[PDB]
Every structure is written in C-alpha cells, then in structure tokens.
Amino acid sequence: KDAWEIPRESLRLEVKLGQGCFGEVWMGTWNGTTRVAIKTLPEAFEAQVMKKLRHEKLVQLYAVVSEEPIYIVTEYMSKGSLLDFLKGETGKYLRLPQLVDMAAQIASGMAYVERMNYVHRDLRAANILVGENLVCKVADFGLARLPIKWTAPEAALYGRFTIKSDVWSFGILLTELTTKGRVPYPGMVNREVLDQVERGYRMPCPPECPESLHDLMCQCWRKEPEERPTFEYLQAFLEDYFTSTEPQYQPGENL
Ligand SMILES: *CCC(=O)Nc1ccccc1Nc1nc(Nc2ccc(N3CCN(C)CC3)cc2)ncc1Cl
C-alpha cells in the first residue's frame, strides 16, 4: 500500500464522459469536492508508470483503486480529446498559430518523457486531452515503458519502441493538427500503409500547410530512427515558429 491508494467510497462518480484510451471514463468527484476523471475497467490495467512522471503537459494521476473494479483517478480536462476537439464544432476555427502552439505543448510534454528516459508508444491526437485556454496534455500510459498508421515501421514490425518511434508518431500527429483531425494516409488500409512506408512513401504536404512545417514532419519520418530529431528540438522549433521560420505567414481559408 502506497500514498496513491484510496478507498472506493472516497470517489463519487457523476456523469459519463465516454469510452476510449483503454475504455470507460467518468466525470466524478473525489474527497468531498474535487472534480476528477475516473477510468474504470486484465489487472495489467497505466497506473504504475504515472506515479513517477509529473509534468504540466502530462495528465496528472491523482489516486488508484487497486481492487476490482479498478479505478484510475486523474485530473479533469474540460474540452476532452484532441481528436474530438479538432473534428468538433470548435476545431473549424483553429488556425495555424493555435495548432502550432498546441503542437509545442505536446512536444513539451514529450520532451519531459524524453529526458526521463521513457517511451509513450501510443502518441496520437486521440490520446491527447484538451482543457481550458487550449491547454493540451499527453495521456494514455498503459503501454508506457523505459495504430499502425501512427507507429514507426521499426516499432510496428520489430517492436523497437524508443523515444525516436514516439518522434515518428509526433510527425503523424502534426498531420492530424494541420488537417483538423483527418485520418492519416487517406484511402489506405493498414497493410498498404506498412508496405509503402517501408519502401519510402511519406504523406504529402497538407493543403495550406507551409513547406517548412512539412519538412519537420519528414524529419520525424526518417528511416533511420537515430536521425530523427529530439522532442527538445521539436519544442523549440514550434514555439519559435512564426518568428524564426515563417515570419511572413498569412492566414488562409483553413490555416
Ligand atoms: C488516454 C486519453 C483519454 O482518456 N481520452 C478520453 C476519451 C473519451 C472519454 C474520456 C477520456 N478521458 C478523459 N477525459 C476528460 N474530460 C472530457 C472528456 C470528454 C468530453 N466530451 C466528449 C463528448 N463530446 C463529443 C465532446 C466533449 C469532455 C471532457 N478528462 C480526463 C480524462 Cl483522463
């Protein structure tokens, strides 16, 4: 028994939020009044890894109920999933400054994972939560260690899950941001994606996306994992994007 363990009565679930990210999540309340999210259900069912990692851009774990039914108590994000937010009614108004700023926050969370010597293994818009003030935080650490279309080929084929394979997933995530949440590799099935990517195919520049931002994607998609950039580099590049890289960016129809 550790400090994370809490009794089951201390939780007071309220309204259902939906499923996804290894299943059911409820909006509820903790000690009296404390709005939290409760993910309910294999006892391998995400908690042991969130205990060591704490960062402003990672969804923070609050407490765990280790017995069946196993609960996972984390902070509450008001806007929900990033993929839903991009596809939802609010996402249509997002422009490149907001999308790049959201990518910078995600890279900041993964930069913490990077220097902690961890791997996420399932980084994508569906596993990123949005809160107030367009705050984005990384979630989904059920697979975290020390979705073929989002997975680096050396990880999907051989299990070589490194922080550099997360960098590959980040490049795919950039296409989700610049297309308002569209599925990558449109019109391609998983086995076709794996075939063409191994042979060197990469997604083209999304419409209205600047070439400089697409070059960052291709860098994340290099065949050699060691040649992929670090999240420390990705964070600094995206935070300084509209001053150092695209100082003459002009708004368009969608970006
Ligand atoms: C691993 C990432 C993840 O858990 N994603 C996820 C997906 C579906 C439901 C819950 C959930 N987890 C969390 N959600 C919140 N807050 C929140 C979720 C969903 C919504 N709405 C979805 C339905 N409507 C279409 C739009 C809004 C709102 C708020 N907070 C924390 C977690 Cl862990």
PDB file of N, CA, C and O and ligand atoms in Angstrom, residues 16-27 36-39 46 50 59 72-82 84-85 88 120 125-130 137-141, ligand 1:
ATOM      1  N   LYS A  16     -21.215  10.290 -17.154  1.00  0.00           N
ATOM      2  CA  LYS A  16     -20.373   9.519 -18.056  1.00  0.00           C
ATOM      3  C   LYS A  16     -19.805  10.417 -19.147  1.00  0.00           C
ATOM      4  O   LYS A  16     -20.501  11.278 -19.692  1.00  0.00           O
ATOM      5  N   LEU A  17     -18.525  10.212 -19.466  1.00  0.00           N
ATOM      6  CA  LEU A  17     -17.849  11.005 -20.484  1.00  0.00           C
ATOM      7  C   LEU A  17     -17.645  10.263 -21.797  1.00  0.00           C
ATOM      8  O   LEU A  17     -17.498  10.910 -22.839  1.00  0.00           O
ATOM      9  N   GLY A  18     -17.635   8.935 -21.775  1.00  0.00           N
ATOM     10  CA  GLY A  18     -17.425   8.129 -22.955  1.00  0.00           C
ATOM     11  C   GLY A  18     -16.332   7.109 -22.740  1.00  0.00           C
ATOM     12  O   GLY A  18     -15.748   6.992 -21.665  1.00  0.00           O
ATOM     13  N   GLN A  19     -16.057   6.356 -23.798  1.00  0.00           N
ATOM     14  CA  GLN A  19     -15.030   5.326 -23.780  1.00  0.00           C
ATOM     15  C   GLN A  19     -13.873   5.722 -24.688  1.00  0.00           C
ATOM     16  O   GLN A  19     -13.908   6.741 -25.383  1.00  0.00           O
ATOM     17  N   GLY A  20     -12.832   4.893 -24.667  1.00  0.00           N
ATOM     18  CA  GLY A  20     -11.607   5.197 -25.376  1.00  0.00           C
ATOM     19  C   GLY A  20     -10.433   5.303 -24.428  1.00  0.00           C
ATOM     20  O   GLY A  20     -10.625   5.497 -23.222  1.00  0.00           O
ATOM     21  N   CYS A  21      -9.217   5.186 -24.959  1.00  0.00           N
ATOM     22  CA  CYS A  21      -7.998   5.156 -24.156  1.00  0.00           C
ATOM     23  C   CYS A  21      -8.092   4.059 -23.097  1.00  0.00           C
ATOM     24  O   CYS A  21      -8.042   4.303 -21.889  1.00  0.00           O
ATOM     25  N   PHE A  22      -8.256   2.830 -23.590  1.00  0.00           N
ATOM     26  CA  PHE A  22      -8.429   1.620 -22.792  1.00  0.00           C
ATOM     27  C   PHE A  22      -9.748   1.594 -22.026  1.00  0.00           C
ATOM     28  O   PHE A  22      -9.899   0.813 -21.080  1.00  0.00           O
ATOM     29  N   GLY A  23     -10.710   2.423 -22.408  1.00  0.00           N
ATOM     30  CA  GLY A  23     -12.094   2.218 -22.035  1.00  0.00           C
ATOM     31  C   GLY A  23     -12.661   3.326 -21.167  1.00  0.00           C
ATOM     32  O   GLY A  23     -12.002   4.311 -20.839  1.00  0.00           O
ATOM     33  N   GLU A  24     -13.931   3.119 -20.803  1.00  0.00           N
ATOM     34  CA  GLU A  24     -14.801   3.964 -19.988  1.00  0.00           C
ATOM     35  C   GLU A  24     -14.096   4.975 -19.090  1.00  0.00           C
ATOM     36  O   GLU A  24     -13.204   4.616 -18.316  1.00  0.00           O
ATOM     37  N   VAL A  25     -14.510   6.239 -19.179  1.00  0.00           N
ATOM     38  CA  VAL A  25     -14.044   7.301 -18.294  1.00  0.00           C
ATOM     39  C   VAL A  25     -15.263   8.075 -17.807  1.00  0.00           C
ATOM     40  O   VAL A  25     -16.149   8.409 -18.602  1.00  0.00           O
ATOM     41  N   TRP A  26     -15.306   8.359 -16.508  1.00  0.00           N
ATOM     42  CA  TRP A  26     -16.409   9.081 -15.889  1.00  0.00           C
ATOM     43  C   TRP A  26     -15.913  10.401 -15.319  1.00  0.00           C
ATOM     44  O   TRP A  26     -14.787  10.487 -14.819  1.00  0.00           O
ATOM     45  N   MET A  27     -16.756  11.427 -15.392  1.00  0.00           N
ATOM     46  CA  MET A  27     -16.536  12.658 -14.643  1.00  0.00           C
ATOM     47  C   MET A  27     -17.182  12.503 -13.273  1.00  0.00           C
ATOM     48  O   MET A  27     -18.384  12.238 -13.174  1.00  0.00           O
ATOM     49  N   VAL A  36     -12.718  15.186 -10.828  1.00  0.00           N
ATOM     50  CA  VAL A  36     -11.711  14.267 -11.339  1.00  0.00           C
ATOM     51  C   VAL A  36     -12.317  13.450 -12.472  1.00  0.00           C
ATOM     52  O   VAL A  36     -13.524  13.480 -12.720  1.00  0.00           O
ATOM     53  N   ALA A  37     -11.452  12.712 -13.161  1.00  0.00           N
ATOM     54  CA  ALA A  37     -11.858  11.729 -14.152  1.00  0.00           C
ATOM     55  C   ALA A  37     -11.511  10.339 -13.641  1.00  0.00           C
ATOM     56  O   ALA A  37     -10.414  10.116 -13.121  1.00  0.00           O
ATOM     57  N   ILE A  38     -12.450   9.408 -13.782  1.00  0.00           N
ATOM     58  CA  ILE A  38     -12.290   8.045 -13.288  1.00  0.00           C
ATOM     59  C   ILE A  38     -12.391   7.103 -14.479  1.00  0.00           C
ATOM     60  O   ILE A  38     -13.471   6.941 -15.061  1.00  0.00           O
ATOM     61  N   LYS A  39     -11.272   6.481 -14.841  1.00  0.00           N
ATOM     62  CA  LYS A  39     -11.261   5.456 -15.876  1.00  0.00           C
ATOM     63  C   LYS A  39     -11.420   4.090 -15.221  1.00  0.00           C
ATOM     64  O   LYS A  39     -10.565   3.670 -14.433  1.00  0.00           O
ATOM     65  N   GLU A  46      -0.733   1.548 -16.754  1.00  0.00           N
ATOM     66  CA  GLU A  46      -1.344   2.870 -16.827  1.00  0.00           C
ATOM     67  C   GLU A  46      -1.191   3.609 -15.504  1.00  0.00           C
ATOM     68  O   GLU A  46      -1.043   4.829 -15.477  1.00  0.00           O
ATOM     69  N   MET A  50       2.393   6.289 -14.272  1.00  0.00           N
ATOM     70  CA  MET A  50       2.010   7.667 -13.990  1.00  0.00           C
ATOM     71  C   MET A  50       2.426   8.122 -12.598  1.00  0.00           C
ATOM     72  O   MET A  50       2.398   9.328 -12.327  1.00  0.00           O
ATOM     73  N   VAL A  59      -1.121  14.459 -18.299  1.00  0.00           N
ATOM     74  CA  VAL A  59      -2.295  14.318 -17.445  1.00  0.00           C
ATOM     75  C   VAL A  59      -1.854  13.730 -16.112  1.00  0.00           C
ATOM     76  O   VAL A  59      -1.219  12.670 -16.063  1.00  0.00           O
ATOM     77  N   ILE A  72      -9.047   4.484 -11.985  1.00  0.00           N
ATOM     78  CA  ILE A  72      -7.876   5.325 -12.217  1.00  0.00           C
ATOM     79  C   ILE A  72      -8.344   6.772 -12.177  1.00  0.00           C
ATOM     80  O   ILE A  72      -9.102   7.210 -13.052  1.00  0.00           O
ATOM     81  N   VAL A  73      -7.892   7.516 -11.171  1.00  0.00           N
ATOM     82  CA  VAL A  73      -8.352   8.876 -10.916  1.00  0.00           C
ATOM     83  C   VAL A  73      -7.289   9.849 -11.406  1.00  0.00           C
ATOM     84  O   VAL A  73      -6.146   9.824 -10.933  1.00  0.00           O
ATOM     85  N   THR A  74      -7.663  10.709 -12.349  1.00  0.00           N
ATOM     86  CA  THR A  74      -6.773  11.724 -12.894  1.00  0.00           C
ATOM     87  C   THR A  74      -7.489  13.068 -12.909  1.00  0.00           C
ATOM     88  O   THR A  74      -8.675  13.171 -12.584  1.00  0.00           O
ATOM     89  N   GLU A  75      -6.751  14.105 -13.296  1.00  0.00           N
ATOM     90  CA  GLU A  75      -7.335  15.430 -13.419  1.00  0.00           C
ATOM     91  C   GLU A  75      -8.348  15.463 -14.560  1.00  0.00           C
ATOM     92  O   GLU A  75      -8.318  14.641 -15.480  1.00  0.00           O
ATOM     93  N   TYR A  76      -9.256  16.431 -14.489  1.00  0.00           N
ATOM     94  CA  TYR A  76     -10.322  16.578 -15.470  1.00  0.00           C
ATOM     95  C   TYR A  76      -9.934  17.620 -16.510  1.00  0.00           C
ATOM     96  O   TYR A  76      -9.524  18.732 -16.161  1.00  0.00           O
ATOM     97  N   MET A  77     -10.063  17.254 -17.782  1.00  0.00           N
ATOM     98  CA  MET A  77      -9.842  18.159 -18.901  1.00  0.00           C
ATOM     99  C   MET A  77     -11.190  18.517 -19.509  1.00  0.00           C
ATOM    100  O   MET A  77     -11.970  17.626 -19.864  1.00  0.00           O
ATOM    101  N   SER A  78     -11.461  19.818 -19.628  1.00  0.00           N
ATOM    102  CA  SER A  78     -12.808  20.267 -19.968  1.00  0.00           C
ATOM    103  C   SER A  78     -13.154  19.983 -21.427  1.00  0.00           C
ATOM    104  O   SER A  78     -14.272  19.550 -21.728  1.00  0.00           O
ATOM    105  N   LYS A  79     -12.218  20.221 -22.346  1.00  0.00           N
ATOM    106  CA  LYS A  79     -12.509  20.073 -23.767  1.00  0.00           C
ATOM    107  C   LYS A  79     -12.444  18.630 -24.253  1.00  0.00           C
ATOM    108  O   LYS A  79     -12.929  18.344 -25.353  1.00  0.00           O
ATOM    109  N   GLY A  80     -11.859  17.722 -23.477  1.00  0.00           N
ATOM    110  CA  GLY A  80     -11.829  16.328 -23.876  1.00  0.00           C
ATOM    111  C   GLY A  80     -10.672  16.007 -24.809  1.00  0.00           C
ATOM    112  O   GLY A  80      -9.599  16.609 -24.745  1.00  0.00           O
ATOM    113  N   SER A  81     -10.911  15.041 -25.694  1.00  0.00           N
ATOM    114  CA  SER A  81      -9.873  14.551 -26.591  1.00  0.00           C
ATOM    115  C   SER A  81      -9.498  15.599 -27.633  1.00  0.00           C
ATOM    116  O   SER A  81     -10.325  16.408 -28.065  1.00  0.00           O
ATOM    117  N   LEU A  82      -8.229  15.569 -28.049  1.00  0.00           N
ATOM    118  CA  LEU A  82      -7.772  16.487 -29.088  1.00  0.00           C
ATOM    119  C   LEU A  82      -8.371  16.130 -30.441  1.00  0.00           C
ATOM    120  O   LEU A  82      -8.729  17.020 -31.222  1.00  0.00           O
ATOM    121  N   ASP A  84     -11.298  14.743 -31.002  1.00  0.00           N
ATOM    122  CA  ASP A  84     -12.669  15.244 -30.995  1.00  0.00           C
ATOM    123  C   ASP A  84     -12.702  16.761 -31.129  1.00  0.00           C
ATOM    124  O   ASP A  84     -13.540  17.311 -31.853  1.00  0.00           O
ATOM    125  N   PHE A  85     -11.795  17.454 -30.436  1.00  0.00           N
ATOM    126  CA  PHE A  85     -11.768  18.912 -30.491  1.00  0.00           C
ATOM    127  C   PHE A  85     -11.492  19.409 -31.907  1.00  0.00           C
ATOM    128  O   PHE A  85     -12.132  20.358 -32.375  1.00  0.00           O
ATOM    129  N   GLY A  88     -14.603  18.552 -33.898  1.00  0.00           N
ATOM    130  CA  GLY A  88     -15.803  19.173 -33.382  1.00  0.00           C
ATOM    131  C   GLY A  88     -16.062  20.543 -33.986  1.00  0.00           C
ATOM    132  O   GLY A  88     -15.374  21.016 -34.891  1.00  0.00           O
ATOM    133  N   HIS A 120       6.370   6.436 -24.819  1.00  0.00           N
ATOM    134  CA  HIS A 120       4.916   6.504 -24.732  1.00  0.00           C
ATOM    135  C   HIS A 120       4.246   5.380 -25.517  1.00  0.00           C
ATOM    136  O   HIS A 120       3.332   4.723 -25.006  1.00  0.00           O
ATOM    137  N   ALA A 125      -3.466  12.042 -31.595  1.00  0.00           N
ATOM    138  CA  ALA A 125      -4.452  13.030 -31.165  1.00  0.00           C
ATOM    139  C   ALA A 125      -5.527  12.411 -30.282  1.00  0.00           C
ATOM    140  O   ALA A 125      -6.032  13.072 -29.367  1.00  0.00           O
ATOM    141  N   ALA A 126      -5.886  11.149 -30.530  1.00  0.00           N
ATOM    142  CA  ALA A 126      -6.913  10.504 -29.716  1.00  0.00           C
ATOM    143  C   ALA A 126      -6.465  10.340 -28.271  1.00  0.00           C
ATOM    144  O   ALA A 126      -7.304  10.300 -27.363  1.00  0.00           O
ATOM    145  N   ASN A 127      -5.156  10.248 -28.034  1.00  0.00           N
ATOM    146  CA  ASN A 127      -4.606  10.077 -26.695  1.00  0.00           C
ATOM    147  C   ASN A 127      -4.043  11.375 -26.129  1.00  0.00           C
ATOM    148  O   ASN A 127      -3.122  11.347 -25.305  1.00  0.00           O
ATOM    149  N   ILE A 128      -4.574  12.514 -26.560  1.00  0.00           N
ATOM    150  CA  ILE A 128      -4.185  13.816 -26.039  1.00  0.00           C
ATOM    151  C   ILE A 128      -5.448  14.566 -25.649  1.00  0.00           C
ATOM    152  O   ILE A 128      -6.400  14.642 -26.434  1.00  0.00           O
ATOM    153  N   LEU A 129      -5.458  15.110 -24.437  1.00  0.00           N
ATOM    154  CA  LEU A 129      -6.627  15.773 -23.883  1.00  0.00           C
ATOM    155  C   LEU A 129      -6.437  17.283 -23.896  1.00  0.00           C
ATOM    156  O   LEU A 129      -5.320  17.791 -23.751  1.00  0.00           O
ATOM    157  N   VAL A 130      -7.545  17.996 -24.076  1.00  0.00           N
ATOM    158  CA  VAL A 130      -7.551  19.450 -24.163  1.00  0.00           C
ATOM    159  C   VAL A 130      -8.365  20.000 -23.001  1.00  0.00           C
ATOM    160  O   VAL A 130      -9.423  19.459 -22.661  1.00  0.00           O
ATOM    161  N   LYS A 137      -2.510  18.237 -22.999  1.00  0.00           N
ATOM    162  CA  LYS A 137      -1.709  17.378 -22.139  1.00  0.00           C
ATOM    163  C   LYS A 137      -1.688  15.960 -22.691  1.00  0.00           C
ATOM    164  O   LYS A 137      -2.698  15.468 -23.205  1.00  0.00           O
ATOM    165  N   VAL A 138      -0.534  15.309 -22.581  1.00  0.00           N
ATOM    166  CA  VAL A 138      -0.363  13.944 -23.062  1.00  0.00           C
ATOM    167  C   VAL A 138      -0.980  12.974 -22.064  1.00  0.00           C
ATOM    168  O   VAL A 138      -0.864  13.150 -20.845  1.00  0.00           O
ATOM    169  N   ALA A 139      -1.642  11.941 -22.581  1.00  0.00           N
ATOM    170  CA  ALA A 139      -2.239  10.924 -21.727  1.00  0.00           C
ATOM    171  C   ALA A 139      -1.944   9.536 -22.283  1.00  0.00           C
ATOM    172  O   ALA A 139      -1.082   9.389 -23.157  1.00  0.00           O
ATOM    173  N   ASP A 140      -2.622   8.514 -21.758  1.00  0.00           N
ATOM    174  CA  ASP A 140      -2.504   7.142 -22.250  1.00  0.00           C
ATOM    175  C   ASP A 140      -1.123   6.535 -22.021  1.00  0.00           C
ATOM    176  O   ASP A 140      -0.313   6.440 -22.951  1.00  0.00           O
ATOM    177  N   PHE A 141      -0.859   6.083 -20.798  1.00  0.00           N
ATOM    178  CA  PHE A 141       0.418   5.482 -20.446  1.00  0.00           C
ATOM    179  C   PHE A 141       0.261   4.018 -20.047  1.00  0.00           C
ATOM    180  O   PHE A 141       1.092   3.472 -19.320  1.00  0.00           O
TER     181      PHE A 141
HETATM  182  C1  LIG B   1      -5.962   8.439 -22.713  1.00  0.00           C
HETATM  183  C2  LIG B   1      -6.749   9.680 -23.181  1.00  0.00           C
HETATM  184  C3  LIG B   1      -8.242   9.652 -22.855  1.00  0.00           C
HETATM  185  O1  LIG B   1      -8.531   9.118 -21.738  1.00  0.00           O
HETATM  186  N1  LIG B   1      -9.352  10.106 -23.579  1.00  0.00           N
HETATM  187  C4  LIG B   1     -10.751  10.060 -23.273  1.00  0.00           C
HETATM  188  C5  LIG B   1     -11.651   9.712 -24.319  1.00  0.00           C
HETATM  189  C6  LIG B   1     -13.045   9.629 -24.149  1.00  0.00           C
HETATM  190  C7  LIG B   1     -13.581   9.895 -22.900  1.00  0.00           C
HETATM  191  C8  LIG B   1     -12.725  10.242 -21.845  1.00  0.00           C
HETATM  192  C9  LIG B   1     -11.323  10.329 -21.965  1.00  0.00           C
HETATM  193  N2  LIG B   1     -10.508  10.706 -20.801  1.00  0.00           N
HETATM  194  C10 LIG B   1     -10.536  11.924 -20.047  1.00  0.00           C
HETATM  195  N3  LIG B   1     -11.490  12.899 -20.360  1.00  0.00           N
HETATM  196  C11 LIG B   1     -11.540  14.108 -19.635  1.00  0.00           C
HETATM  197  N4  LIG B   1     -12.519  15.138 -19.937  1.00  0.00           N
HETATM  198  C12 LIG B   1     -13.530  15.188 -21.039  1.00  0.00           C
HETATM  199  C13 LIG B   1     -13.759  14.120 -21.950  1.00  0.00           C
HETATM  200  C14 LIG B   1     -14.701  14.146 -22.995  1.00  0.00           C
HETATM  201  C15 LIG B   1     -15.539  15.244 -23.267  1.00  0.00           C
HETATM  202  N5  LIG B   1     -16.527  15.300 -24.345  1.00  0.00           N
HETATM  203  C16 LIG B   1     -16.677  14.148 -25.275  1.00  0.00           C
HETATM  204  C17 LIG B   1     -18.112  14.154 -25.879  1.00  0.00           C
HETATM  205  N6  LIG B   1     -18.404  15.365 -26.670  1.00  0.00           N
HETATM  206  C18 LIG B   1     -18.497  14.925 -28.101  1.00  0.00           C
HETATM  207  C19 LIG B   1     -17.348  16.393 -26.605  1.00  0.00           C
HETATM  208  C20 LIG B   1     -16.741  16.562 -25.153  1.00  0.00           C
HETATM  209  C21 LIG B   1     -15.324  16.317 -22.366  1.00  0.00           C
HETATM  210  C22 LIG B   1     -14.375  16.287 -21.316  1.00  0.00           C
HETATM  211  N7  LIG B   1     -10.660  14.391 -18.595  1.00  0.00           N
HETATM  212  C23 LIG B   1      -9.748  13.429 -18.319  1.00  0.00           C
HETATM  213  C24 LIG B   1      -9.638  12.194 -18.992  1.00  0.00           C
HETATM  214 CL1  LIG B   1      -8.414  11.127 -18.480  1.00  0.00          CL
END
